């Protein structure tokens, strides 16, 4: 059963560049997922992604540029306040230099350093580098 519609969508992206699949056939077009792929394009991690919509769910095509290493996911959505976001950096990132964990607070979906300027505590969905 499709338990979490978030995480299963993430991993097949990581199961593309290893054999070098420059494209991704992807399902099933949720609006929380559409709020997420542009964050990759907000730092230029993938290629062009497009979404056809059948009148059941929709499905996603994703091209890839090949700059990724691994996108990940913590499960389920742990609740994280402001004063303890830094714990989820060092356990999830290679360093403070690059990479981005991505949570979502009551204001929306963002980067952690974006959230470190927006200052509103929220829930982890995933991470990538």
């Amino acid at each position: 059963v499709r338990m979490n519609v978030l995480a299963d969508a993430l991993k097949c992206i990581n199961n593309a560049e290893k054999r070098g699949k420059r494209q991704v056939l992807l399902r099933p077009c949720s609006k929380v997922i559409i709020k997420f792929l542009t964050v990759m394009m907000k730092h230029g991690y993938i290629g062009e992604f497009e979404i056809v919509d059948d009148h059941r769910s929709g499905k996603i095509v994703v091209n890839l540029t090949g700059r990724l290493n691994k996108c990940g996911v913590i499960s389920p959505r742990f609740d994280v306040p402001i004063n303890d976001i830094e714990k989820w950096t060092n356990n999830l990132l290679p360093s403070r230099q690059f990479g981005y964990v991505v949570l979502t607070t009551s204001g929306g979906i963002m980067d952690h350093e974006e959230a470190r300027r927006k200052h509103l505590g929220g829930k982890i969905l995933g991470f990538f580098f």
Binding site: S75, P76, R77, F78
Partner: protein, 143 residues
């Protein structure tokens, strides 16, 4: 393949710890409450005992050695205690039926050297500091 990553699961998830505390066989050393049972002097550091008799033990194979061991009774719980003397000689420093202090043997409770069934080592005899008697720092009282 298993482990319970559900969020609202914690009421399962510390019952399933304690149900497997006594698998780790070096963690029942105090948890079952047996330190008053069979650590043969009662769960303290050392034991103000009394000498019973000098016993003729033999070392483990392939080592034909005779460790010249002693028998102890205790005034704390009153059982039979088999101890061991270092630093060859000192059987003439025993002077049997003496109020003896006896410590452990330095493995947290097992047979250490080639020496079976002896889970102790002496450090004191007759309240007069057994260790410094070979180097003759303290004069040994005889009577």
């Amino acid at each position: 393949m298993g482990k319970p990553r559900g969020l609202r699961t914690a009421r399962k998830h510390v019952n399933h710890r304690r149900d497997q505390r006594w698998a780790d066989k070096d963690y029942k050393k105090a948890h079952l409450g047996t330190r008053w049972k069979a650590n043969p002097f009662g769960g303290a550091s050392h034991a103000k005992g009394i000498v019973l008799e000098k016993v003729g033990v033999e070392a483990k194979q392939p080592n034909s050695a005779i460790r010249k061991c002693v028998r102890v009774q205790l005034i704390k719980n009153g059982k039979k205690i088999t101890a061991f003397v270092p630093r060859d000689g000192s059987l003439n420093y025993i002077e049997e039926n003496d109020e003896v202090l006896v410590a452990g043997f330095g493995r947290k409770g097992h047979a250490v050297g080639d020496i079976p069934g002896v889970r102790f080592k002496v450090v004191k005899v007759a309240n007069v500091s057994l260790l410094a008697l070979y180097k003759e720092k303290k004069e040994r009282p005889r009577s």
